[PDB]
């Protein structure tokens, strides 16, 4: 369901997004810029599709 372009689809929550070089987390802690509200940051993103589901990472 998750699609990588910014991310859109059906996502309950997005967690760790980074350039695959640097990574950014929900809240902004970073290691080597993020807009948390916009759902925008190879790009790889950690996500969950429901409250009861397992953690997954998808590539773009």
């Amino acid at each position: 369901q998750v699609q990588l372009q910014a991310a859109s689809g059906t996502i309950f929550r997005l967690y760790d997004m980074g350039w695959y070089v640097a990574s950014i987390t929900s809240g902004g802690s970073t290691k080597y810029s993020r807009d948390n509200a916009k759902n925008t940051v190879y790009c790889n993103a950690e996500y969950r599709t429901g409250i009861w589901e397992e953690l997954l990472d998808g590539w773009g």
Partner: protein, 287 residues
């Protein structure tokens, strides 16, 4: 008569499904901390289906008068229904306690819930349930009723005002208090679940925890649906002292609440197979 066959067929269907399912659940679980609580629930259900229902069918649905089980049986039957009522609610609240400790205090839980301490906490629950059901022993008896043909009946043997106190106290201890604790602990868990990225520090153990917590929450919702109407009926006896419409509404509400008492004893095994793939395979293997 037509109503009697209709009610009797619904009870027989529940008895077959409930008996086989809870009996399998015991062996299936047999061959860890979660396992004991689900085992204890299966046992409360088996007593309800094997002892309470046969008395209800004979001396309530088919033969209204006279009572045939003697004075002792009259006292024993009401005592059993209360004892089962307490055991079920206490198990669901304690099962809710085990899930909460796993999510919000993982390291502390390991010692707090240990297999030896789990066996002891379940024993206390059964002992407590029987003690809470002792008052109904004294409230009910067998009396010879003169001249409604006269004869032996199972009826309350104390003042009707005092009887109301006994019913209200049971409602608070068996339903209201459990619901308040269960509501608070589940609210807390969901707030943690919606925030944390990983629980227990691995993906596999995180996925396992979320699936088990979801299963227990389904147990809770089924409990609220079956038991809350039953307490409302009991509360009508205390506070609702009629036309043809109102009479019929009260008659049917009473029969519906009676069927729900048995439905509660049969729902769990069905829920386990639907929610969990692993239980289904072992259960299907054992069954």
């Amino acid at each position: 008569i037509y109503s009697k066959v209709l009610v009797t067929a619904v009870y027989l269907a529940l008895f077959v499904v409930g008996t086989v399912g809870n009996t399998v659940t015991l062996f299936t679980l047999a061959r860890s901390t979660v396992h004991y609580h689900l085992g204890s629930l299966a046992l409360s259900d088996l007593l309800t289906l094997l002892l309470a229902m046969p008395v209800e069918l004979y001396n309530f649905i088919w033969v209204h008068h006279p009572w045939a089980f003697g004075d002792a049986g009259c006292r024993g039957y009401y005592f059993l229904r209360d004892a089962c009522t307490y055991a079920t609610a206490l198990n669901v609240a304690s099962l809710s306690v085990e899930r909460y400790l796993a999510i919000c205090h993982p390291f502390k839980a390991k010692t707090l819930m240990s297999r030896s301490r789990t066996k002891k906490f379940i024993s206390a629950i059964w002992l407590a349930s029987a003690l809470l059901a002792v008052p109904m022993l004294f409230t009910m008896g067998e009396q010879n009723r003169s001249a409604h043909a006269g004869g032996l009946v199972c009826t309350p043997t104390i003042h009707t005002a005092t009887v109301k106190v006994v019913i209200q106290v049971n409602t608070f201890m068996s339903f209201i208090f459990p619901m308040v604790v269960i509501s608070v602990l589940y609210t807390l868990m969901i707030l943690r679940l919606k925030s944390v990225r990983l629980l227990s520090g691995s993906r596999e153990k995180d996925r396992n925890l979320r699936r088990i917590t979801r299963l227990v929450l389904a147990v809770v919702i089924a409990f609220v649906v079956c038991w809350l109407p039953y307490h409302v009926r009991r509360l009508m006896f205390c506070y609702i002292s009629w036309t043809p419409f109102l009479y019929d509404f009260y008659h049917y509400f009473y029969m519906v609440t009676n069927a729900l008492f048995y439905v509660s004893s049969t729902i769990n095994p069905i829920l386990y197979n639907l929610v969990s793939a692993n239980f289904r395979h072992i259960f299907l293997a054992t069954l």
